[PDB]
Nucleic acid binder design. Structure first.
Ligand SMILES: [Zn+2]
Ligand SMILES: [Zn+2]
Ligand SMILES: [Zn+2]
Lengths: 846, 49, 50, 50
DNA sequence: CTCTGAATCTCTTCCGACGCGCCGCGAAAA
RNA sequence: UCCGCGGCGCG
DNA sequence: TTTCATTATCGGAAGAGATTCAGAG
């Protein structure tokens, strides 16, 4: 009669509808419709299990809920499911798609007959027709695995976070895999700061053949030992001895070489490639990949399988045979093996139709065209004939010294043709055809000085590579790990490189000390493997959840105790010699979620003797020189002072335009501090950058009695914005107007009226706690028209009710950056709108 | 109308009706040709046809 | 012998070949190739044996 | 009379009459040069060390 | 096992009397 | 009016 | 005073050019 197909994306809905036709209706169920509770809408344990929804002691009883704005979509889905005869759950291949399909089946009801689980790797006529010829049942095991993961992460977050608030600082968060990623970054930071760049020199030689060709070589042995002078004088002596000596080509080596393409990309490989070639990080890469998949041009972008369908292989082999021809075929397909634990049922990330060139993607933004070009190029490259190089190696001897050249010359190019290198390498040159035992004539020689490379910093893609190596997280997780480590304030990313905040070090050390089992890489990997076993149906979800929860609760109940008992150590203050501008006292070095700062011990004294004066630790932001290449990090390490008490490097902060402060890397475990004088261009407060809408000057982030505000450096302008729960900074501060007469409804608060680029909106006076917002009605504004600032008055003039007598709400037309008024019935738009045009309000069908 | 008019006026198989004598009338109306659209051209008709 | 000589190995490759044959100078494409083939031979839109 | 062309334009005869006189003047095949002259590819004059 | 040359295949081009006679009819350009 | 194209026959 | 993810908003002949099999290295 009329089948219903349910899908998570509206663009997936439009695309699958192109192939399904009139016998089917397709509906988009945008995101997770059902979930565990999120807002406030032995009694401490009772309140904890209510806030969690999950009760670990009462056998995992979960108390799922439907989130605000989902009720309309749930009602539409239910109405369509009542109209339909058979329901087709067409979520993506992975667990999350199974958990969405489960929530859909459970909300809509009638399980035993009225559901089919559709499964397709690409949104195309043949794949869809084959999937609808043979749909499955809902894989409940994978749903259970996803629920187990979610329950673990909520258990750890909600149980740990109050502990960290009590011991260390309010406004911390924690997470199972997140904390282990932070541990990785902090360990690399400690390796970097505790490293010494040594000094080695190298010599380079310039030579001409009897045939007048020219050759350049590098010098690598003295006295049959490795040539590695330690100082300048030694290098100059070596250069002298070299110049005096006479050179001959005692060694002539030659050999063919063959080079092959990489595998078609898995998600981690795609992120690494997009970072290295195009500069896209993780978020942009996965957003554009999701768009390309939803448009239909590429296969699903969450995969760890390198496998390819026979259809794909035949298509690409046809393309190569037609365009390139037989030399680049080659004789048989290039196989690639993924991990034995990989989702080998999945495909790689490949084009859906190899003939669609990136330029043809009319509806994709240019960055997405570039990403598609990368996917296409890799897919074509993987199956072609490997390339062919011939290689020459030369060694030349003079006195106590031997010096070497290596060069390769390229003679078949097949995979390199489609997928060229970014730049020529050091061996991508032509050594002249000197004979065996040839002679050489000599040109003047150059020394070079180089420093030992530290254990160099990880970027987003290299951190994803490290996680993939250890087995922490999975293809679906990686983007969430990389985002959440930043959002939670333990790690910051700058110069496309990862840097670890002092608070991340504190939390890492505390969590390692107290929760050693949770933070150990092996136990994280074993947990991920056990979730994979659950998805296999090798294990029982509730079982492993119970085992985890028992261990975690043991460690928590140990950790809660006093520090003399051995419980989690509280926050700590490292004193130094500095005069508090408010009392002169010695001053100590402190870490907050905002950063690292200088505090006066009177903060710990009761009101009578309390001192709230604080100083910002404006840091010397490391400015890595891109032109120094690999040197750039080494010289940064060289730039740092070294602590007197230990080898660990020191990190640098500005306290006055006259004074600067050095602090040891192992602070507060190490108590070394140094203070230095000089003419310094101090910022007063350092951190993020923001541009003042009222004067265009730089604007900077500052802390005080109300937490964190944002304030503009121009002394003639005091324009200040403010931080808010889930955004970089609030919109232009102009006339925030309070109303006591509008009550909130989910909370006891009262409503306030606010302006910004988003529009004009009502928001609740305890905003970080209430977080309740709704658009104003026109009649509301009219009721409080005297309060409205002079400009906003026009909105109160607007027509309060539509021609049907429905009621009207005030909306921002982002495409045209103007307010308009619109009416809704049953919560759907009536399709009526009125706009402001030259002092008048004009109204009609939308 | 344009298609009908063009077929009846300009098509190769709508030639002038010759009216010398009634025998001409009959033999012209009863004539059966292999030329025209979809047929074959004069300059390529071999002896086999 | 014909099966020993045809470069093609599946339905898609043959469709690509026929597209490449009947219209030079334009890129092959799954949907367009399928559409022109079906409307050219197995549809009354363009073909009719009276 | 005469007409000046905003863009220099080649002759059809020497371009297409087999054998292509311009083609034999160069070492280029005739196909790539004709697709060039209808503006579907560039031609390169060297300077430097690519 | 690979590379080059030679030979065939595939495509493109050119062209099939000539002299009349007769008939009709041009246009999204003005 | 003198231009061009298509069809038909004659030798 | 809070902490959790993860969304998706005509026939024949000749000439030139291109791909194919056979011989040498
Ligand atoms: Zn003080
Ligand atoms: Zn130290
Ligand atoms: Zn300002």
């Amino acid at each position: 009669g009329k089948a219903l197909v349910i899908v998570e994306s509206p663009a997936k809905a439009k695309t699958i509808n192109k192939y399904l036709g009139s016998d089917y209706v397709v509906k988009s169920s945008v995101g997770h419709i059902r979930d565990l509770p999120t807002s406030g809408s032995k009694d401490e344990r009772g309140a904890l299990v209510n806030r969690m929804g999950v009760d670990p002691w009462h056998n995992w009883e979960a108390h799922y809920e439907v989130l605000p704005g989902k009720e309309k979509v749930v009602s539409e889905l239910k109405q369509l499911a009542e109209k339909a005869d058979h329901i087709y759950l067409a979520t993506d291949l992975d667990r999350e798609g199974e958990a969405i399909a489960w929530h859909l089946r459970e909300v809509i009801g009638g399980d035993d007959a009225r559901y089919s689980r559709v499964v397709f790797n690409e949104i195309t006529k043949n794949a869809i027709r084959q999937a609808f010829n043979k749909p499955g049942e809902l894989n409940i095991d994978r749903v259970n695995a996803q629920q187990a993961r979610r329950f673990m992460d909520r258990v750890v977050g909600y149980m740990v976070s109050p502990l960290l608030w009590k011991k260390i600082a309010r406004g911390l968060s924690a997470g199972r895999v997140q904390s282990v990623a932070v541990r990785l970054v902090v360990e690399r930071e400690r390796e970097i700061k505790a490293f010494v760049p040594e000094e080695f020199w190298e010599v380079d030689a310039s030579t001409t053949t009897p045939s007048g060709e020219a050759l350049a070589l590098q010098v690598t042995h003295q006295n049959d030992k490795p040539f590695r002078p330690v100082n300048k004088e030694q290098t100059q002596a070596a250069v002298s001895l070299l110049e005096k000596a006479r050179y001959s080509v005692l060694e002539r080596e030659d050999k063919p070489t063959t080079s092959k393409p990489g595998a078609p990309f898995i998600t981690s490989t795609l992120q690494q490639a997009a970072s290295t070639r195009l500069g896209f990080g993780v978020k942009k890469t996965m957003m554009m990949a999701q768009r390309l998949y939803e448009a239909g041009y590429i296969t699903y972008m969450r995969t760890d399988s390198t496998n390819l369908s026979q259809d794909a292989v035949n298509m690409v082999r046809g393309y190569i045979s037609d365009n390139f021809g037989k030399k680049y075929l080659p004789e048989s397909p290039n196989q690639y093996a993924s991990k034995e634990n990989s989702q080998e049922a999945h495909e790689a990330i490949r084009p859906s139709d190899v003939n669609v060139m990136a330029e043809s993607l009319k509806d994709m933004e240019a960055d997405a065209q570039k990403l598609y070009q990368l996917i296409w190029r890799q897919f074509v490259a993987c199956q072609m004939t490997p390339a062919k190089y011939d290689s020459t190696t030369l060694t030349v001897g003079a006195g106590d010294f031997r010096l070497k050249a290596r060069g390769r010359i390229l003679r078949f190019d097949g995979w390199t043709k489609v997928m060229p290198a970014l730049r020529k390498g050091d061996e991508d040159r032509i050594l002249p055809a000197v004979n065996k035992g040839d002679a050489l004539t000599l040109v003047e020689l150059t020394p070079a000085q180089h420093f030992t490379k530290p254990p160099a910093r990880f970027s987003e893609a290299s951190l994803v590579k490290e996680l993939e190596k250890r087995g922490i997280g999975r293809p679906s997780t990686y983007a969430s790990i990389i985002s959440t480590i930043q959002d939670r304030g333990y790690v910051r990313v700058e110069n496309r490189r990862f840097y670890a905040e002092k608070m991340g070090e504190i939390v890492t050390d505390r969590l390692e000390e107290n929760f050693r089992e949770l933070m150990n890489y092996d136990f994280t990997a074993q947990m991920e493997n056990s979730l994979d076993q659950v998805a296999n149906h090798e294990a029982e979800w509730k079982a492993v959840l119970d085992h985890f929860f028992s261990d975690f609760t043991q460690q928590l109940d140990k950790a809660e105790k006093d520090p003399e008992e051995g419980g989690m150590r509280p926050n700590q203050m490292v004193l130094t010699s500095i005069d508090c501008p408010t009392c002169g006292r010695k001053m100590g070095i402190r870490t907050a979620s905002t950063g690292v700062f200088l505090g006066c011990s009177g903060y710990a004294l009761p009101p009578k003797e309390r001192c709230k004066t604080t100083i910002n630790l404006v840091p010397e932001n490391e400015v890595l020189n891109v032109l120094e290449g690999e040197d750039a990090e080494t010289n940064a390490l060289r730039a740092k002072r070294r602590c007197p008490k230990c080898g660990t490097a020191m990190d640098s902060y500005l306290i006055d335009p006259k004074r600067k402060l050095h602090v040891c890397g192992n602070n507060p475990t190490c108590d070394g501090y140094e203070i230095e004088e000089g003419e310094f261009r101090i910022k007063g407060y350092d951190g993020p950058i923001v541009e003042c809408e009222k004067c265009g000057s730089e604007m900077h982030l500052k802390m005080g009695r109300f937490g964190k505000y944002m304030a503009c450096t121009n002394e003639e302008c005091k324009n200040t914005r403010k931080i808010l729960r889930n955004g970089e900074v609030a919109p232009p501060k102009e006339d925030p107007v309070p109303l006591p007469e509008l009550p909130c409804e989910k909370s006891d608060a009262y409503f306030v009226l606010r302006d910004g680029a988003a529009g004009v909106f009502l928001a609740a006076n305890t905003f970080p706690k209430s977080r309740e917002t709704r658009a104003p009605l026109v009649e509301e504004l009219y009721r409080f028209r005297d309060r409205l600032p002079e400009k906003l008055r026009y909105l109160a003039d607007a027509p309060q009710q539509d021609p049907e007598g429905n009621k009207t709400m005030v909306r921002f037309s982002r495409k045209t950056k103007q307010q308009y008024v619109s009416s809704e019935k049953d919560g759907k738009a009536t399709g009526w709108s009125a706009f402001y045009v030259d002092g008048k309000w004009v109204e009609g069908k939308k | 109308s344009a298609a009908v008019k063009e077929f009846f006026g300009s098509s190769q198989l709508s030639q002038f009706m010759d009216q010398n004598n009634p025998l001409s009338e009959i033999t012209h109306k009863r004539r059966i040709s292999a030329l025209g659209p979809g047929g074959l051209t004069r300059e390529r008709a071999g002896f086999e046809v | 012998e014909t099966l020993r000589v045809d470069p093609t190995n599946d339905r898609l490759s043959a469709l690509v070949e026929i597209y490449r044959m009947m219209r030079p100078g334009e890129p092959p494409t799954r949907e367009a190739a399928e559409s022109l083939f079906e409307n050219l031979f197995f549809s009354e839109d363009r073909y009719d044996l009276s | 009379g005469h007409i000046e062309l905003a863009s220099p334009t080649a002759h059809i005869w020497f371009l297409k009459s087999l054998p292509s006189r311009i083609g034999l003047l160069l070492d280029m095949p005739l196909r790539d040069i004709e697709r060039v002259l209808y503006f579907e590819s560039y031609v390169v004059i060297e300077g430097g060390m690519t």
